[PDB]
Design an enzyme around this catalytic site. Sequence first.
Site, PDB file in Angstrom:
ATOM      1  CE  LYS A   1      22.135  28.722   8.737  1.00  0.00           C
ATOM      2  NZ  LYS A   1      22.002  27.864   9.948  1.00  0.00           N
TER       3      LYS A   1
ATOM      4  CE  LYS B   1      11.648  20.675   7.348  1.00  0.00           C
ATOM      5  NZ  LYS B   1      10.796  21.234   6.254  1.00  0.00           N
TER       6      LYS B   1
ATOM      7  CG  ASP C   1      20.221  28.361  14.033  1.00  0.00           C
ATOM      8  OD1 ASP C   1      19.223  28.935  14.516  1.00  0.00           O
ATOM      9  OD2 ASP C   1      20.460  28.331  12.808  1.00  0.00           O
TER      10      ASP C   1
ATOM     11  NE  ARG D   1      13.264  44.904  17.855  1.00  0.00           N
ATOM     12  CZ  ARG D   1      14.220  44.256  18.511  1.00  0.00           C
ATOM     13  NH1 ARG D   1      15.426  44.790  18.624  1.00  0.00           N
ATOM     14  NH2 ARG D   1      13.965  43.073  19.056  1.00  0.00           N
TER      15      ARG D   1
ATOM     16  CD  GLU E   1      20.092  25.642   6.781  1.00  0.00           C
ATOM     17  OE1 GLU E   1      19.278  26.394   6.203  1.00  0.00           O
ATOM     18  OE2 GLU E   1      20.404  25.776   7.985  1.00  0.00           O
TER      19      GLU E   1
ATOM     20  CG  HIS F   1      15.111  22.155  14.036  1.00  0.00           C
ATOM     21  ND1 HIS F   1      13.870  22.543  14.495  1.00  0.00           N
ATOM     22  CD2 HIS F   1      15.620  23.227  13.381  1.00  0.00           C
ATOM     23  CE1 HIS F   1      13.644  23.795  14.140  1.00  0.00           C
ATOM     24  NE2 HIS F   1      14.689  24.233  13.463  1.00  0.00           N
TER      25      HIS F   1
END
Lengths: 428, 428, 428, 428
Positions: free
Chosen positions: C314, C172, C223, C47, C204, C228
């Site tokens: 996370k 994967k 998320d 942008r 993570e 997944h």
Amino acid sequence: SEFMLDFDLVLFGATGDLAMRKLFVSLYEIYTHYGFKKDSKIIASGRKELSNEEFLALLCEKTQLHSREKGEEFLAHISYFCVRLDNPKDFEELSKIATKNKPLIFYFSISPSFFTTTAQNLAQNALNHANTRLILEKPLGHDLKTCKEIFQSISAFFKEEQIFRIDHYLGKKGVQNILELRLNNPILNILWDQISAVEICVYETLGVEERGEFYDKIGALRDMVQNHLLQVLSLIATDLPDDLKDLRKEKIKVLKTLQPPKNFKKQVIRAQYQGYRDENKVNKESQTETFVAIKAFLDTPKFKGVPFYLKHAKKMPHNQASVKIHFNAVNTLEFFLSQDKITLTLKDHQNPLILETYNKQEFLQPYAKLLYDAIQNNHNNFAHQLELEASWVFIDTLIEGFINNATPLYSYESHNLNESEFLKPLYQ
Amino acid sequence: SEFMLDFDLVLFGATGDLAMRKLFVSLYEIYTHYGFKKDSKIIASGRKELSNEEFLALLCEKTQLHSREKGEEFLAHISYFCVRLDNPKDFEELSKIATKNKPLIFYFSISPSFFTTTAQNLAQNALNHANTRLILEKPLGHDLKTCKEIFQSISAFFKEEQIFRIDHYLGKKGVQNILELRLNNPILNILWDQISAVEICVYETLGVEERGEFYDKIGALRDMVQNHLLQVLSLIATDLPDDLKDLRKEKIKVLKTLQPPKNFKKQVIRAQYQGYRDENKVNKESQTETFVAIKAFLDTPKFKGVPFYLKHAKKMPHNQASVKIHFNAVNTLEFFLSQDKITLTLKDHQNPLILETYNKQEFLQPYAKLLYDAIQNNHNNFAHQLELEASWVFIDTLIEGFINNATPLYSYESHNLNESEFLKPLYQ
Amino acid sequence: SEFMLDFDLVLFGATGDLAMRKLFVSLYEIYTHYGFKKDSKIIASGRKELSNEEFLALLCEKTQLHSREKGEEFLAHISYFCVRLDNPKDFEELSKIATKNKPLIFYFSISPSFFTTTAQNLAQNALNHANTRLILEKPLGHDLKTCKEIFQSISAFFKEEQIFRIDHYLGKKGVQNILELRLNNPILNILWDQISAVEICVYETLGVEERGEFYDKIGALRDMVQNHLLQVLSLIATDLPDDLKDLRKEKIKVLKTLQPPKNFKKQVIRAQYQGYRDENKVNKESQTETFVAIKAFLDTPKFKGVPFYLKHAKKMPHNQASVKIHFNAVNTLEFFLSQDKITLTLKDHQNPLILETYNKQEFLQPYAKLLYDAIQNNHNNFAHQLELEASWVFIDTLIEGFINNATPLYSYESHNLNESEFLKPLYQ
Amino acid sequence: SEFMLDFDLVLFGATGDLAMRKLFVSLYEIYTHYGFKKDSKIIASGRKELSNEEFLALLCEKTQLHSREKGEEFLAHISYFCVRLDNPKDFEELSKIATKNKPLIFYFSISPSFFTTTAQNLAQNALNHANTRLILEKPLGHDLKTCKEIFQSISAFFKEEQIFRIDHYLGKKGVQNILELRLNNPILNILWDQISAVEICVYETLGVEERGEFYDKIGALRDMVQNHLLQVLSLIATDLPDDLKDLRKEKIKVLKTLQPPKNFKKQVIRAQYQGYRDENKVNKESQTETFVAIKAFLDTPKFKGVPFYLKHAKKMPHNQASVKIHFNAVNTLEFFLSQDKITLTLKDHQNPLILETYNKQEFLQPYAKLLYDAIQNNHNNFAHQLELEASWVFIDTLIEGFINNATPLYSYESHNLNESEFLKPLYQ
């Protein structure tokens, strides 16, 4: 008696972290690999009053010994005797049950400041006869003066053959590998004269967790570098002995060549992890380091200008325990200390090649092997006074620097330090 | 006498922040400027067990007094004695060491919730004889009720001459200047009748920093405004008495004219910096203010309609500590509180003018001067009970307002607040 | 066209995090492994206005592609083209340069709220002809309504063969191993009927990575768990069909058997790391979770009563990504998702046995494989609409619970959580 | 001559921020300190169209020049002429307005992409005679290539002696003090041969502040170090010429000896403040630095081995703008750049001594001094093409290093950096 062993061991500090992580399990390992005589006794001791039934419950909650193969039969050997370490009358009551006919071992799994007092309270109650043995912990003081003091005071009631200075790294197979390989491989005999750098590093993911009453008085440098890592250093840097019995001599020799830092900021980095001051029973204004990295030098011809990086820390991102012996910036011989692993790094035109040998565990954990050596009156794998004293000379230099704030006490987040970025000053 | 001082001082909270920032150095300043007798003793105390050498190592790292000119002979006067304030038997061990022949001062560098208990445990062990003096830190309680209760309870075993309410702003040359200049300059007697606004402001760049346990029960308003800023306000606004023995009275008087807010949302702004709730030992659901600004008024004719802005906060962009007396919009008299600096702002046809007087600090910092006064049994520069009680009336009003969320607890980025933009509503 | 591919790809999220960590490097891997036709174009778009040289500087600093084997030649295929949010002139200029002669791929490395709009502005400028393909990101909406809506809105101007729903876990090797082994090993057909628990876990150490704006509207559950982990679950539970072309059908089937919680507090744990609310563009009073753990059940006979633990978070202490299939308490089959590694745990008389395979990573990372599939117009390894919708039913239940505070939003210190203690309630 | 000034100045971009912030007021200052001939004209110009009366109002509103001491007498010299930079016929019309033999100065306060165009339309309408001068703003390229390109393009209409490249630090009184003192004090001629280190430092507490679109393409290094700090370095390090018209020559000479880093990790530290990526219109993944420190060296004998620390950064804790010329590790001559303050630091046995001059005054504002120099046809305080080219050689090296991530982009908290600790690597 080689097997089926006849002995009593009273374990001071039996409710502490070391006792519950490594010592009782080491005793179970010895029990399953060699057997106990029916009347061999393991008397746990602490400051609080517990019944045998309550202490056995504590032990089984903390260690899972009850579910092991010979669990019930081992725990049948364990009792609890409350001892407060200050009033000799607890020791008088302990002396009516201490055997005079078999080796009787006192294990000081307690902070070194209680050693002399405890030893005194033993001799004042006729618990220092020839059949008595003392196992004292690794730091043995917090500087050279107190090391000499503890030695001087305890030698007034105990003979040498009764004192065992335990440093459990001398029982790790990875550490023994260093000297075995140096002795039995001419190729290393030639390459050791051309070493360019050494890295002795022990990082742990754990922190202290209320062990702070004692950690806050010691800190990482004295906790591990003064004893474990410097023992390893001496094994790396020693002239190879003609008689293995003269090894002690040469080890002291090399430790005496340790140089004090020429430039503290270029050679010393210390830090303390966020949340350490909130652990229970640490002063909220504590300066105790949970992280050390030292670039050390030896004044011997064979190592002139060769940096020895000594690194140890808690609350790190990964567990690591290694010796990287660097030749020439691409070739490095690595001895893992918590595994029996040896590695040689070679470089191809594109990427690195690692050559490896690996084997499984002996099942005799380092402490067990050493406790067995102690029950056999075998001193060869225990730390010797003069080694510790030379270590303290060097370490005292570094501590004096810490008090002069000669390098700052940095901070780091648990499990999130970037070790390579943080230590660039040392490697430049 | 003046020199060679004979005294023992037991310092409660010796491992705390105040002890390590200003107090031990203040004692060193007294030592170098007046001398101690060889056997005068400074007994640092705290709740964890440390050794004399370990406490000295902590002190020497945080202050560097060992490197000062007579540092080592000063430290020779310091030792450490563990007293857990929750344990009355620790107070029995204490007083086996308490002198009966020289002034013995107990310094309560601890949170007010421990005052009464400690005092009782002192009186419970015959540690309240005539040679004993109590120094009670700036927060005397956390409201009028607890202030009165602490006083009433301690007066039962301690006489007035034995209790010293310390407020170290009363030892600051900048603060003393206000009252000295007002008393010795008729020009200010006349200009005081035309004051248009007063600004008392104390901003710090630092934060709570390991004092969260205490701070979270106290907050900015009681930490600094209840005592320091209100003492300063009383010094500005007190009628100057004909006979100075009455100054105490007049101070109380003016404090009693403090008005509760007529409109809370428009007269009070409170805030808390980002990261405070994550500090060690702070509630993540905390409503404790680290920033407060108040527009207060006095119901006395000489200041009818005159706003007194009281501002204090931590983690601010710059350190600042000042009293601005605005006489009109172009003329303003500023007393600096952390410097011996006074300024008067005038205007010429074109430019602004600042008339300034700066003198460098005295060797003795405020805590040194007040401790010296305490060793001499001189109460003149200490806070008096009824002053504190009137202050608590006003402050309790504001705290109850805080409890009812009568104005929102704003947030601000540490070191990045825009004070003027944030407070424009306040000054209109 | 296996080699020397002729294609133009417009990458919209080109200055974002995903583009700079995995996508441009994936294109480089394809370039070195298959070659590009000289005129194949990679048009990075964002942008902000940048020149080709400035975007090339940014990409090369974040990726170091220029120093790779064929780096400069690959970079020669790259240009930057500014296209702003809903700007009709930027999309007109974009369509003035688009080829009509080769596959033209638009990659939506952007937030899903901007998918329909972008697609419209694409079709509004005759950029939806047959040679065009859209690659849409993993989060397809934030609930079932918006998923259906985006599909409907885009399906008005693009045919289904032009739409690619990318879920890079499907590329994967570790993930593919699950279904391959299930199809090619009857032993697993038999053992799947005695599964006692399944554990799908992705932790993570990284956090939001300055993508707060997007993350705060999505949260951990949507998320990663919506797409997944639920894809992985469907691959674990798929009734293996006689014809592989029915696989999609069967996957939907199992996803539709997902049961909503019997007890939200006992089956769902959410949390948010300290400092998340201080991240850029995050609400200071946000309720968005950075941590989820779910005990789910399928109302299918083969899995009656079998818990599927779904865990993702996370700022954790270690990276981990695995599927544990527990057949009993001693036998566990583990599929590693980021390493081609498979493990089977067996028992000996006293000790454990681990059977293992490991194979080194393929030279194409998952995004490279899937981008290559896209350039070949191969949909087989892309996500299907109804799979996502069935996932959304369940996920929407859990989100509805989050909004009503059906289980508390705990806090945890970044990198320093103790996962086992925190989740013991979940596993009881 | 020195006084009544006969000139015409056409100010292109007169509606911009620079024109209204510093240029018109500087012209008024020149007018009051030196006087204008009645026929000297200040022709404000821009692409928009206005009457004299309307532009004067605009100027007045923004600047209050009409309310200044001699305001209308100055405003009478100002008129507006509309010129569309793409239209040559407007440039014909201005030719009728320029007097043909007196100095005619064009101020290019416009974006550089128009320079060539405008220059053409000036030479296209006989507005580039010898009596003509061009004043070009600091930004003239972002590397050596673009610098040369702009120069070559413009040099086809104006000769080098007609071009005045503005670097507004050369008009700062503090900066001029360096060369005045060096020229007029023999003691410095001797001490300059023994300099041990130089420090050029510009720290600001503000950040990018709305200008983020532009800043992110430039970064701290090019924003300030490429031009201001290196000009200052050249003033410090040049050999003093016999005739001052050779000064530029010598400046160029010394700059050509700037060495590229021998060790990037040891000589360059860069960083970006927290919250920069969140400033409006800054890239979400920007690597642009808001902080730089460079340890530079010159390959000239008078300075062999002498480090020049060049430091500049935003969102710092304090404003600073200084040159510290270190003569040894204790003696330092400091030129303040924004104050007209000079300092000499000496040491006595215990403390440091600071010898000061402080003439708080207003010589002339920087742009007033430089505009006067331009109207007088004096080039010494303007940049010469080769000064810029040598500067870009060095700076381009450092930029290449940034792209190769040769030293990491650290982060820092706004207004809370600890500069001395952060830069220990540079000074160790």
